[PDB]
């Protein structure tokens, strides 16, 4: 249960 998410709109990897 990893917390690596990549939203589209941010282009980032860090959604904490």
Same mark, same amino acid.
């Given at each position: 249960?990893?917390?690596?998410?990549?939203?589209? *709109?941010?282009?980032?990897?860090? *959604?904490?």
């Amino acid at each position: 249960v990893p917390i690596i998410y990549c939203n589209r *709109r941010t282009x980032k990897c860090q *959604r904490f």
